[PDB]
Each structure stands twice: as structure tokens, then as C-alpha cells.
Amino acid sequence: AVEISPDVLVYKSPLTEQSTEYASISNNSDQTIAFKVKTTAPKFYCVRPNAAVVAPGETIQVQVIFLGLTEEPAADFKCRDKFMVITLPSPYDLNGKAVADVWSDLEAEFKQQAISKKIKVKYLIS
């Protein structure tokens, strides 16, 4: 019962300026989870946080900051950028380490338990 949304991040207005849309991870289970957000276009989006733990009953909001294209908005363009949210059980105390520190161990131990979600991106004039 991990919920990840939305299906599509929609950036509007001047695509020549920075803009922020939001994703969300809610842990409705009884067990702490960890998530990680992968970006196919890291030169254009800043993600924060890109990895974190979510306690039972907690919702974490993820900032997806579009850095903009001070260039050409383009007429009749289809954005192909995508984000992949991967969520895993996080049953161990991190011992002060960051989630990024332990992620590879978590994914190696709990790959079968993963709950993944591919978030698409859309540009909207105007």
C-alpha cells in the first residue's frame, strides 16, 4: 500500500523560465519504506528529495524543478522526459547513513518487493 502520484507532471507558461511541479509518495503500510527518484534528463530537472524514507502513515512531497529552456519553447512538441520512482522496504536502522548510501544494499536484498512507477512529463502552452 505505497501510493505514488501523479502519472504526468505538467509544466506550463514560459518554458523558458524555471517552474516546480510536485510528485508524492504516501506510505499507507505498517512498515517504513525508502524511495529513490531517477531522472532521464538530469540537465533539465532538479529533484528534491531524490531519496528518502517514508514512515508508516506519512506522505513525502517531491519537488521536481524544471530548470527551463531559455531557448525556444517549440511549437507542437512532445516532451519525452520521464521519472522513475522506486520504492523498497526499509526495515533496518540507517545508522546515520543517507538513503543513497544504503540503497544498493536495499535493492539487492528486496528487489522482489519493489513497487515502481514511471512518471511522464508534458509541456503545456500556454
Side-chain angles (χ1 to χ4, degrees):
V2 187
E3 302 176 16
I4 308 163
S5 59
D7 303 325
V8 191
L9 299 162
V10 176
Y11 297 89
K12 323 98 169 187
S13 230
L15 302 166
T16 67
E17 294 189 316
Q18 297 178 351
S19 181
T20 300
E21 298 300 318
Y22 302 90
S24 198
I25 328 290
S26 301
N27 180 17
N28 296 318
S29 74
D30 63 351
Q31 279 141 175
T32 302
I33 62 149
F35 71 85
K36 184 182 189 180
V37 182
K38 294 182 183 277
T39 303
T40 63
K43 288 171 174 174
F44 294 84
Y45 308 89
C46 294
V47 189
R48 184 167 54 253
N50 65 302
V53 299
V54 191
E58 179 183 30
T59 295
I60 298 301
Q61 186 183 51
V62 177
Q63 298 175 256
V64 192
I65 303 168
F66 179 47
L67 298 174
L69 332 169
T70 77
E71 320 79 64
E72 40 230 316
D76 179 71
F77 172 68
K78 148 81 174 308
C79 181
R80 303 293 302 277
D81 303 330
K82 296 173 168 205
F83 299 87
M84 179 68 116
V85 184
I86 316 266
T87 64
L88 262 51
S90 194
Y92 307 108
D93 191 294
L94 294 198
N95 292 319
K97 307 180 188 213
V99 175
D101 260 325
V102 305
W103 181 264
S104 93
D105 300 325
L106 281 183
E107 77 150 51
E109 188 173 343
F110 300 104
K111 48 186 184 179
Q112 194 234 346
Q113 309 242 69
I115 291 299
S116 306
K117 161 84 158 195
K118 192 188 222 68
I119 304 181
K120 285 171 152 46
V121 178
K122 184 190 184 65
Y123 295 164
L124 181 70
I125 320 140
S126 187

